[PDB]
Design a protein around this nucleic acid. Structure first.
Lengths: 128, 136, 73, 37, 176, 126
RNA sequence: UACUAAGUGGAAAAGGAUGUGAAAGUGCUAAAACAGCAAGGAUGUUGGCUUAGAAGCAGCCAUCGUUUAAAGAGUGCGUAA
RNA sequence: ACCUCGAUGUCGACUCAUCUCAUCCUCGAGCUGAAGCAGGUUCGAAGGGUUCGGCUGUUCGCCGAUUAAAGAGAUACGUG
């Protein structure tokens, strides 16, 4: 099923949202309401289809390697491991891991931290 | 091309070659080497063609060393010329390659790519490629 | 492999016949020429070759001549 | 169709066969179908 | 190697007799003939509701015939007990297929449609004007029909205009 | 391998004998998201999930002093989620992945070393 | 005695092709292994150079970790993604 | 510097054309970066056909004018 990444407000990216079978505004308001606590931070949720689409969806935690910058205390973007994206702190790394834990396949904090370290390597830093 | 600064003689004959092991037995400085299965009077045009083919298929990450040189001089004879009047025009420089000479050595690229480069050079050559390893 | 190729003094109709095409029109000249290929050019060459009566059937017109019924001659 | 002296895999799926004593490379895509290998 | 594979034998009417140069497979749908070469590259036996014909010799073509003939035994048994089925995709805006009696008519890029007869045993049906479904007995005859249809005009490689096998592909490039 | 066969048979026999309270639940088409879900719930438990060789598993359970030589044998792609450590949370995860499965069946196993089929295992495994 | 499916012998060469018989080591394996066959082919996967729609492959990069026997920013095919 | 000078008549043309097909066409399809109406390549194909004139004298070489086609060469660089 279609995989999308929305922001706290606008749901412009991709017509994949329109493929779930509902009017855009009627579900955009629901997404804004359920993602209100996460406003301003992009969240890559997963869509699930329904006939009327009253409520069928799953909140997938904000994506690491763009969430990594939050722990690294900046917002610099990168595509290569060669360039270094600041420095990541341990406390917010653990916060990211346990917050990404539900997003991860595992339910252990150590595996969450390991996955975060693996995916954060894209921007140029591992969890430390 | 491989132009010598001078030569021991202006027009050395098409001298006969004897010997199955003389000159560049193995690759002195490379890892793999091309051996020609035709011991004869060879020219530097095909040598440079093989070298440029090897560089083309290797780029520049692999290193190439030549180890022989067209010392003597050999002639090719055009038309409408009666035989005689001395030796013909020395059309090209020539190396009298006996069997068992390493002229081309390639290195610094994977072994399969080196073998492919030697095959390429052999296809740009009248001779058949042979793969040789280092013995130092 | 073995087609049959012929060119007489005539030109423009060089005869090339496949094995299956030979069975459609003529078969006596096949063995006729095969046997005459082992006959030197002499007075009785084309007279020797007529003794090789080539037939496509088990019978022959010379049964009144007391033929010797045998095989592989 | 074509004429060469050696046949090698050209496309992603270019199978090498021996058709009428002639070694050929034929691809599922009709483009890469040579002869005389 | 398919050469040894437990092909099931159907007791309704399917029975297999292996001659020194041929195999006959009889069943509800006529009978299928596997024309063996003069030599025997397989050992031919039929167990109770089973068949595993091994190779009695190993050679260049001996094993190849062994595999191909085990595969054809499988195909023959299943197509004589139930029959096979090929599909032709006559794809095009103005390309239309239809069946009258046992004759298939096709409307290709020509304004004058073409018609062709189908060998008996192979029955042809049209569910959509762009679809032809030929359910027969042996795959050899249905494939013969298919190849005698295709080789005249193949489909366009840009957008499908012709007869597709459904086991053949085309490549798109420049040009609209 | 043959040595691999023997070693795996031995180890699985020991694990099914000591921990006779197990569940060798099998899903043909064992999936990745389903393994994800079951091990998410399973974590905090010693159990794992795997797709194992049917021959080694069947011979081991034959030698594991447990009922079954064909009940732990050929059925499509044989997956296993053995019940190890506490089989309570393990069976909670097995039930969760059965719910995540289109059609998952109780292949074999006992809860707390007591006979428990689909009608009785899931009564306590819920 | 083979070898052939070319009539090679009775045309080859630069070179190519699982050509074959034979030779030579090879793990699985008769608890059915490998490739068709049941297959998962996921997660961070929307990660970025970034585009209402390149975000998982017009193209590129870190292509690594996590569930695990196993899943590659996907090998590829393919969606405007 | 050879079979050929005690000779072996050749340039070109007209006519006769034939042949091998490394094809121009026809016939046939593939491949097609072939959008179709037409087809670029490739081979099979000798089976047939495969321009007239003014001008260097002449087919040919310039120019004008033709069809689907106005062939890659030999026949003592065909012919006497």
């Amino acid at each position: 099923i279609a995989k999308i990444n929305l922001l706290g407000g606008q749901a412009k990216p991709g017509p994949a949202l329109a493929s779930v079978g509902i009017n855009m505004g009627e579900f955009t308001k629901q997404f804004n309401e359920k993602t209100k606590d996460k406003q301003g931070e992009m969240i890559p949720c997963v869509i699930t289809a329904y006939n009327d689409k009253s409520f069928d969806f799953i909140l997938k935690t904000t994506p690491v390697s763009i969430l990594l910058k939050q722990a690294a205390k900046l917002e610099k973007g990168a595509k290569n491991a060669k360039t270094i994206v600041g420095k990541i702190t341990m406390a917010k790394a653990k916060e990211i891991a346990q917050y990404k834990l539900v997003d991860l396949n595992a339910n252990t904090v150590e595996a969450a931290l390991k996955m975060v370290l693996g995916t954060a390597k894209q921007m140029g830093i591992e969890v430390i | 091309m491989l132009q010598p600064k001078r030569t021991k003689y202006r027009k050395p004959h098409n001298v006969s070659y004897e010997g199955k092991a003389k000159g560049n037995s193995y690759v002195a400085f490379g890892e793999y080497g091309l051996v020609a299965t035709k011991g004869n009077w060879i020219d530097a045009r095909a040598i440079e063609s093989a070298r440029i083919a090897i560089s083309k298929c290797l780029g520049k990450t692999g290193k190439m060393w030549i180890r022989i040189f067209p010392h003597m001089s050999k002639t090719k004879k055009p038309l409408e010329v009666r035989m005689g009047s001395g030796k013909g025009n020395p059309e090209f420089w020539v190396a009298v390659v006996k069997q068992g000479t390493v002229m081309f050595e390639v290195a610094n690229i994977p072994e399969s790519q080196m073998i492919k480069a030697l095959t390429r050079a052999g296809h740009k050559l009248p001779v058949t490629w042979k793969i040789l390893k280092r013995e130092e | 492999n073995e087609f049959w190729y012929h060119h007489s003094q005539y030109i423009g109709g060089i005869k090339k016949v496949s094995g299956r095409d030979m069975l459609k029109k003529q078969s006596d000249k096949l063995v006729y020429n095969a046997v005459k290929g082992m006959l030197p050019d002499n007075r009785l060459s084309r007279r020797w070759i007529t003794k090789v009566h080539v037939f496509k059937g088990d019978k022959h017109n010379m049964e009144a001549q007391k033929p010797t019924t045998l095989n592989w001659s | 169709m074509k004429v060469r002296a050696s046949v090698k895999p050209i496309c992603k799926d270019c199978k090498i066969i021996k058709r009428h004593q002639i070694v050929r490379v034929i691809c599922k895509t009709q483009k890469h179908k040579q002869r005389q290998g | 190697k398919i050469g040894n594979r437990t092909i099931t034998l159907d007791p309704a009417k399917v029975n297999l007799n292996f001659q020194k140069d041929h195999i006959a497979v009889k069943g509800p749908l006529g009978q299928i003939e596997l024309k063996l070469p003069p030599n025997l590259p397989l050992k031919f036996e039929l167990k109770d509701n089973n068949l595993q014909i091994t190779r009695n010799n190993e050679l260049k073509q001996s094993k190849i015939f062994h595999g191909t003939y085990n595969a054809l035994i499988t195909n023959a048994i299943i197509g004589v007990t139930q029959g096979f089925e090929k599909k032709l995709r006559l794809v095009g805006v103005g390309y239309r297929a239809n069946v009258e009696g046992e004759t298939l008519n096709l409307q290709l890029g020509y304004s004058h449609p073409i018609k062709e007869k189908i060998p008996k045993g192979l029955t042809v049906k049209v569910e959509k004007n762009t679809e032809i479904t030929i359910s027969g007995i042996s795959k050899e005859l249905v494939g013969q029909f298919a190849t005698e249809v295709r080789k005249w005009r193949k489909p366009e490689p840009y957008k499908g205009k012709g007869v597709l096998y459904f086991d053949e592909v085309i490549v798109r490039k420049a040009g609209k | 391998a043959k040595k691999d066969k023997a070693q795996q048979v031995a180890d699985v026999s020991h694990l099914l004998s000591t921990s006779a309270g197990f569940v060798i639940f099998d899903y043909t088409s064992m999936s990745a998201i389903e393994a994800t879900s079951i091990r998410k719930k399973l974590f905090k438990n010693g159990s794992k999930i795997k797709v194992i060789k049917n021959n080694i598993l069947r011979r081991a359970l034959k030698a594991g002093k447990f009922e079954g030589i064909d009940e732990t044998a050929i059925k499509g792609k044989l997956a296993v989620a053995v019940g190890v450590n506490e089989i309570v949370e393990t069976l909670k995860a097995v039930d969760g992945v059965v719910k995540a499965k289109e059609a998952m069946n109780f292949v074999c196993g006992y809860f707390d070393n007591r006979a428990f089929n689909s009608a009785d295992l899931e009564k306590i495994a819920k």
